[PDB]
Write a protein that binds this DNA or RNA. Structure first.
Lengths: 126, 58, 143, 181
RNA sequence: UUUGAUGGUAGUAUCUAGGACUACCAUGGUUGCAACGGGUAACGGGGAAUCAGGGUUCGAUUCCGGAGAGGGAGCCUGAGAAACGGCUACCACAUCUAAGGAAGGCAGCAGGCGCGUAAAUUACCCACUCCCAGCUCGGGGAGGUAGUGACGAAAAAUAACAAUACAGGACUCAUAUCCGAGGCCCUGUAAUUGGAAUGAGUACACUUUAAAUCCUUUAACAAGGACCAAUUGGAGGGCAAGUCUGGUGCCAGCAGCCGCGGUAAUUCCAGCUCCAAUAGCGUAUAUUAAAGUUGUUGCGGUUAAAACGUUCGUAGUUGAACU
């Protein structure tokens, strides 16, 4: 497989303790890569404990054979859970909360406008 | 004044309705322009045809 | 011939061509408001209507044939016009008081050929596209 | 929003539609380059007329005034980097002599025939649009790829292709699949 | 210009100038260089369509500005509103009512009726761009994102390489507007047959994204035409294209115009073919070019349309040389 992850546009910043990096991934024989096995071999790039890799952005070139994609390396495991647009941990699966469902929720906040303080209507019928 | 109108469709109850039954899906756009390219150059008589036509019978 | 060739006659020139454009028959046709007052079409390409009677227009001589037109009242402002139907068949396919779609004929409003006065042309009848039912690719519903 | 389809529209239909002495000038252009139809023909004629009017209205000014030169050299460089015109003819007059029948042979659908690989100019539309061609690393699936001048050194196969053998047909796989049935 | 019109003057009023409003004087102010009035199928501008130039037509429409939320008027709070996803009334429409009464404005996003030639989902989320709040975190049908989508732009399926079958000219050569051999630097028609490719689909997984789908990337499947089967128009001229065959007989009809048709039709209706542009193309209305038929560039006025019957004449337009 071996994926030949070669990295460019490399720059680090301790403004948010990160390593900005775009990586060139080659697709030699089979298909486009899956993200979770790039992790432990980009944890063979600098050995940065593969659950803190977060290499989430990719697009395969035309014809088949290449992929230039973004990889932001946090330094610590909870600086990875500090700044972090939270739907990126929705991909690196740790979070799924609160069905709303963004239509039933936006009629919750309008139905409970006709109560006064106590909200005695939410306890009876539902 | 006006006589009548019911003489409409006199041809359609008169023609003996012969049909085609066949004819062969042909070479379309990419290959149509090379079939008709050689028909500009298949024999190409190279003659003054004495006031003739390109695709008549004779 | 004529025109003032002095340096400060831009006042006269744009006055004149404004004055004299009102002799042109093509300018003044589109600048008088009669695409709504005189046009039984509502200043537009098509119109819909409901027919009244299927009639025979006597064609202008040298040609001599009754021409099988249809006199229709369009619903936009209730005016009653006469349209021509093409492609013989075309009146055993009408069956009077079906809703019709009507268009122009081609000479930018006024009449065209051997048919005197008739300026409009029937396009669809009862939604089923008269040019396509003439070649029997669509069938008019028996409902 | 925005203007999204910012047109710069090609595919100009001809002025007078039927007359033969221009209709059959362009018909054997489809013969010598096995094109699709007439819209590929006047597309480059549309492309030729814009660089002409550029070179026309540049020629209405004097050298050395910097209006003429500075859009001048950017015109001829984009031609010779493509390479339809070349390095002996590098001023504003020889571009006016350029007609279309050298522009329609700088396309990659004819470059694949000028090297002994296509075996037909009508096979060359099929081989390009079957993902069996490559320029310099890139697999290209269009006939109208205008090639650059130094890019001419690198049109080869891709070895991504089933020639020579990667899933080799796969009608070659079907060669030994028709036997068990 | 009574009932502010133009100015002076003192005031009031407003955040402030000001006839903005009041009181008193003055009689001004605009006008053929088009005022005033009317029309407008008029929101203005950036800009859009089309030409060699000069131009004509359009601009409801994503950007700036104005304007308004059924029709008018009024107004509260607020730094900011004459706010209507605030209130108050009248007018018009509608709503509930146990008949006392109570509330309503989708020219926000979707959706329904209606009018119509004429215009899509009662979908998903704030990851984006930014905005707002007490404000790293909430909210935002602003916004992004799928579903409809031939308005419009772009790249391009509908075959390709060979064999013999039958066949053409041409190349060598018997020969020369006759004629054989290698038929051939040829091409067609072959449900002859046998081969090489392949994306169209399809399907594991992948990438994709807020979560997705589609494309791209894709392990397995997938072409022999009988099918994965391209149609829209025309074949008198203008206008590239059968003096084809049956039908009808100034009929039916066709035709933008010219013209066709009256028991031989190059124009109808069909068969057999052919030609144009091609995932397109035909028709209708408008508009630009064509138009040297609106003429500044650039027309015409003896007879084709056109020098006032005549001369004065103000506005206007044009005006000798000289430093």
């Amino acid at each position: 497989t071996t994926a030949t992850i070669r990295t460019r546009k490399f720059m680090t910043n301790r403004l948010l303790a990160r390593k900005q990096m775009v990586c060139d991934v080659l697709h030699p024989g089979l298909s486009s890569v899956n993200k979770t096995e790039i992790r432990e071999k980009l944890a063979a790039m600098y050995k940065v404990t593969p659950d803190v890799v977060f290499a989430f952005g990719f697009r395969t070139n035309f014809g088949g054979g290449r992929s230039t994609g973004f990889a932001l390396i946090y330094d610590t495991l909870d600086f990875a859970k500090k700044f972090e647009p939270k739907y990126r941990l929705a991909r690196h699966g740790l979070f799924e909360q609160k069905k709303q469902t963004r239509k039933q929720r936006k009629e919750r906040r309008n139905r409970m406008k006709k109560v006064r303080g106590t909200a005695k209507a939410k306890i009876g019928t539902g | 004044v006006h006589g009548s109108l019911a003489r409409a469709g006199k041809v359609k109850g008169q023609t003996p309705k012969v049909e085609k039954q066949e004819k062969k899906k042909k070479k379309t756009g990419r290959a149509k322009r090379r079939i008709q390219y050689n028909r500009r150059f298949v024999n190409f008589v190279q003659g003054f045809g004495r006031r003739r036509g390109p695709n008549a019978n004779s | 011939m004529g025109k003032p060739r002095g340096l400060r006659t831009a006042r006269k020139h744009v006055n004149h061509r404004r004055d004299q454009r009102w002799a042109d028959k093509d300018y003044k046709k589109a600048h008088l408001g009669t695409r709504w007052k005189a046009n039984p079409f509502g200043g537009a390409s098509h119109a819909k209507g409901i027919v009244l009677e299927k009639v025979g227009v006597e064609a202008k001589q040298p040609n001599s044939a009754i021409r099988k037109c249809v006199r229709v009242q369009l619903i936009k402002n209730g005016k009653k016009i006469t349209a021509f139907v093409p492609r013989d068949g075309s009146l055993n396919y009408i069956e009077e008081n079906d809703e019709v779609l009507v268009a122009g004929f081609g000479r930018k409003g006024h009449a065209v050929g051997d048919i005197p006065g008739v300026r409009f042309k029937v396009v669809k009848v009862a939604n089923v596209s008269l040019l396509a039912l003439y070649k029997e690719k669509k069938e008019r519903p028996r409902s | 929003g925005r203007i999204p389809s910012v047109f710069s529209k090609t595919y100009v239909t001809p002025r007078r539609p039927y007359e033969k002495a221009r209709l059959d000038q362009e018909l054997k252009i489809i013969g010598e380059y096995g094109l699709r139809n007439k819209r590929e023909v006047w597309r480059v004629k549309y492309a030729l007329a814009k660089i002409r009017k550029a070179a026309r209205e540049l020629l209405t000014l004097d050298e050395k005034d910097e209006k003429r030169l500075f859009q001048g050299n950017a015109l001829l460089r984009r031609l010779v980097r493509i390479g339809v015109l070349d390095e002996s003819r590098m001023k504003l007059d020889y571009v006016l002599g350029l007609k279309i029948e050298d522009f329609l042979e700088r396309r990659l659908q004819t470059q694949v025939f000028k090297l002994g690989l296509a075996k037909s100019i009508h096979h060359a539309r099929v081989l390009i649009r079957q993902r069996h061609i490559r320029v310099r690393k890139q697999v290209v699936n269009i006939p109208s790829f205008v090639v650059r001048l130094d890019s001419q050194k690198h049109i080869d196969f891709s070895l991504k292709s089933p020639f020579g053998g990667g899933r080799p047909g796969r009608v070659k796989r079907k060669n030994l699949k028709k036997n068990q049935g």
